[PDB]
């Protein structure tokens, strides 16, 4: 009895795709062709940081644009200072695997989790003076992919099996669960205004959720390979994605279709981390060809080679105010470029 | 500079010296990894060396050489993305049961577990991240296989089998396929020790294998080849 239901589903998606095709009228490229080019840009290795002895996976800029947190496969978690290159704290962990870290907007909490299918929240401003484990969150039978903070009392995690959850810190419980994906979710980036977020999975599909109700608002599928990075524009209009098919694309929330495609023949590598610079003109991206590239948003063009590394680039971030960027690569280095 | 800046300097240098001490202390530990079908008695194998928590870890030391023992059984997800974390493993202890060629367990229309194990072993060994990592193979349990070969010819699972009803030639056949599954020859090697409820042997063989692989690695790193 699944054949008839399958055929109504097929015709429904067919007419939806037909409506999507009918909606589009023109491409953004020739509309924005008259935008003046930005020209070449040169960045420099203004500062360097060392002290790690192993791989580096993730980093996150603080809300005040002065503090930095970075993880490593070695069971250490060190907090840096952006300006004077001083070490502030060392956080010895229990499990020796980390794949994501987060920094609280109030500058009091940090989070870190990895393959142990466990989530740990830490407290910094303690009366005694030493960091201590606050609470342990368990219940996911899969490897975590990303942890983000919505406020000082809510934690959002993108699991590995089929789901993403919305925890609360007051009690070790679950407010709600989200289902609808088939593969494994890779990224989960919150929005500048806290009522929406998207979490693409390993099925070349991206679903946009609602924080309060809990229903799949939209659904997109245009890529051929896996999705590995997601980010938002400064406002709540558009977002851009990155795949393993040596290409990046961006969409629109209202238009619900594709807008531009980035492709250059010599590119054969993949995409690892993607972020948008402020003012919404420059889109940065770290590739797998030992290099990092910068592109123009409204025009398909290249501006420079932000690359002086010796291995793959793993984590990439941008300060809130916009003073500089950061690229933590596969080697045990970390360079701030301005 | 104000005094707070200097105080930050001493604090930073103390943290740095703590980090270097911890790194140099923890740099002299060897890492081992396990893989298998799941019904291979991996827990029992761990128990012999010993004498929802997806990753379980144990420590044991024999005659002053620290070993770290792993497990990746409890993931139940796609393997293509979480395998690159373990690029530093010195050796991999692959274990598979050989007597369970019959008694179809997964699906009646599907094939026996022998070919599934062969495909899994091929995928594990021929991956590009582990091009310079030795592989160690153990056979789980034997006496049951010995008492079943007498009542059933081995060719029931192997159409190209042409041997007699004797243990030694059929065994040599089995590790013949296990050996020639590989296609990258000089760098790696396989050992294929037979353990069946035998004490004092598994740890000794593991020690010999890890010493061999570590001395080969040091010789390669010293520019003698």
């Amino acid at each position: 009895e699944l054949d008839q239901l399958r055929q109504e589903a097929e015709q429904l998606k067919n007419q939806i795709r037909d409506a999507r095709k009918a909606c589009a009228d023109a491409t953004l490229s020739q509309i924005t062709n008259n935008i003046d080019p930005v020209g070449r840009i040169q960045m420099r290795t203004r500062r360097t940081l060392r002290g790690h002895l192993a791989k580096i996976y993730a980093m996150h800029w603080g809300t005040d644009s002065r503090l930095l947190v970075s993880a490593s496969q070695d069971g250490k978690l060190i907090i840096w200072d952006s300006y004077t290159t001083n070490k502030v704290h060392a956080i010895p962990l229990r499990s020796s695997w980390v794949m994501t870290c987060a920094y609280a907007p109030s500058g009091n909490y940090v989070a870190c989790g990895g393959l142990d299918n466990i989530c740990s929240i830490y407290n910094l401003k303690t009366r005694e003076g030493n960091v201590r484990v606050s609470r342990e969150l368990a219940g996911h039978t899969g490897y975590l992919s990303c942890c983000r903070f919505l406020d000082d009392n809510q934690i959002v995690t993108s699991s590995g099996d089929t789901t993403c959850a919305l925890w609360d810190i007051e009690t070790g419980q679950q407010t709600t669960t989200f289902t609808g994906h088939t593969g494994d979710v890779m990224s989960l980036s919150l929005a500048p205004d806290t009522r929406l977020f998207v979490s693409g999975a390993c099925d070349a599909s991206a679903k946009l959720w609602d924080v309060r109700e809990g229903m799949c608002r939209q659904t997109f599928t245009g890529h051929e390979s896996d999705i590995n990075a997601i980010c938002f524009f400064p406002n709540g209009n558009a977002f851009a994605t990155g795949s393993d098919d040596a290409t990046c694309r961006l969409f629109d929330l209202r238009a619900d279709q594709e807008l531009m495609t980035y492709s250059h023949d010599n590119i054969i590598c993949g995409i690892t981390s993607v972020s948008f610079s402020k003012s919404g003109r420059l889109l940065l991206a770290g590739y797998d060809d030992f290099n990092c590239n910068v592109w123009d948003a409204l025009k398909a063009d290249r501006a420079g080679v932000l690359a002086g590394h010796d291995n793959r680039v793993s984590c990439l971030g941008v300060t809130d105010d916009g003073m500089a960027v950061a690229t933590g690569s596969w080697d045990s280095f970390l360079k701030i470029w301005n | 500079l104000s005094a707070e800046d200097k105080a930050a300097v001493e604090r930073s240098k103390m943290i740095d010296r703590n980090l270097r001490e911890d790194g140099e202390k923890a740099a002299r530990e060897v890492k081992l990894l396990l893989l298998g079908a799941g019904e291979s008695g991996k827990s029992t194998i761990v128990k012999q060396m010993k004498i929802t928590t997806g990753i379980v870890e144990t420590h044991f030391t024999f005659k002053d050489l620290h070993f770290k023992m792993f497990d990746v059984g409890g993931q139940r997800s796609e393997r293509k993305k979480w395998i690159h974390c373990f690029e530093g493993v010195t050796a991999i202890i692959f274990c598979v049961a050989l007597s369970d060629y019959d008694l179809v367990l997964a699906e009646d229309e599907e094939m026996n577990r022998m070919h599934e194990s062969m495909k899994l072993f091929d995928s594990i060994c021929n991956n590009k991240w582990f091009t310079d990592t030795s592989i160690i193979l153990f056979l789980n349990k034997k006496d049951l296989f010995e008492e079943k070969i007498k009542k059933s010819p081995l060719t029931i699972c192997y159409p190209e089998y042409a041997g007699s009803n004797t243990y030694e030639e059929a065994a040599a056949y089995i590790q013949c396929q296990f050996e020639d599954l590989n296609k990258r020859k000089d760098t790696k090697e396989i050992y294929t020790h037979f353990t069946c409820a035998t004490d004092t042997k598994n740890v000794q063989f593991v020690f010999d294998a890890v010493t061999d692989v570590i001395i080969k690695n040091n010789l390669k790193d010293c520019g003698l080849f």
Partner: single-chain antibody, 233 residues
Framework: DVQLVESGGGLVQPGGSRKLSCSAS????????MHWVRQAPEKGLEWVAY????????YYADTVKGRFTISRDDPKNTLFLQMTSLRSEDTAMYYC??????????????WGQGTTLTVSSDIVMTQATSSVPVTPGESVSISCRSS???????????LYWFLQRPGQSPQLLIY???NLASGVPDRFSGSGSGTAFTLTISRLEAEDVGVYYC?????????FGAGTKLELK
């Protein structure tokens, strides 16, 4: 808790030698630095010594530079002094102060209880006012002046505030200008620029009576303030 204990005391004839000790109660003694402070019987206070973690900086004062020494040991969490010969100016109150220095730190957090001992260039703090009658509730303004400008090239000031109820040890109120402390209400506040600085308070209550001090932390021989007494007629 973070409770501390002081031991040693009594009277000693001039030229005698003694030792004083302080004991820690579970606050990671091996990661924090600490001081000692002299409190005159009816006068202000003085700074006598300083040690830091790792036995790196062993600074002293400029009046007792030779007759005093400090020693610390990580196990058992204890800090020591040594005396050689005491004159009539050494009879005063002796204290203990804990201080940690990092980026977002608040030095001079907890103070001790103290013990009694009876023998039997430098920046100046003006604090011209000494006593000001106050009502049960009103706004009170307290001001102090310095010799050199406190503004450093970084862009942060280095003046502290304090309070002391009768018969009790002090506690921190403002660790840096326009930064409220930890464990105090929001009624207090402060503002200032250049060298002249002023403390302002919104409301009063019958627990704020005491004496207010003033610090400075640019040039290592810390020079204390004068002190202002409130009587609350």
């Amino acid at each position: 808790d973070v409770q501390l204990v002081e031991s040693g005391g009594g009277l000693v004839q001039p030229g005698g030698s003694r030792k004083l000790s302080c004991s820690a109660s579970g606050f990671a003694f091996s990661s924090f630095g600490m001081h000692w402070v002299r409190q005159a019987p009816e006068k202000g206070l003085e700074w006598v010594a300083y040690i830091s973690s790792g036995s790196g900086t062993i600074y002293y004062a400029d009046t007792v530079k030779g007759r005093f020494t400090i020693s610390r040991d990580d196990p058992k969490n204890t800090l020591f002094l040594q005396m050689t010969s005491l004159r009539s100016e050494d009879t005063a109150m002796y204290y203990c102060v804990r201080s940690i220095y990092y980026y977002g730190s608040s030095p001079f957090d907890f103070w001790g209880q103290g013990t009694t001992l009876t023998v039997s260039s430098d920046i100046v703090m003006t604090q011209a006012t000494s006593s000001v009658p106050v009502t049960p509730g009103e706004s009170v303004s307290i001001s102090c002046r310095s010799s050199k400008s406190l503004l450093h090239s970084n862009g942060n000031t280095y003046l502290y505030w304090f309070l002391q109820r009768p018969g009790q040890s002090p506690q921190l109120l403002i660790y840096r200008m326009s930064n409220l402390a930890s464990g105090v209400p929001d009624r207090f506040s402060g503002s200032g620029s250049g060298t002249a600085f002023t403390l302002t308070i919104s409301r009063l209550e019958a627990e704020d009576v005491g004496v207010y001090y003033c610090m400075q932390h640019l040039e290592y021989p810390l020079t204390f303030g004068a002190g202002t007494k409130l009587e609350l007629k």
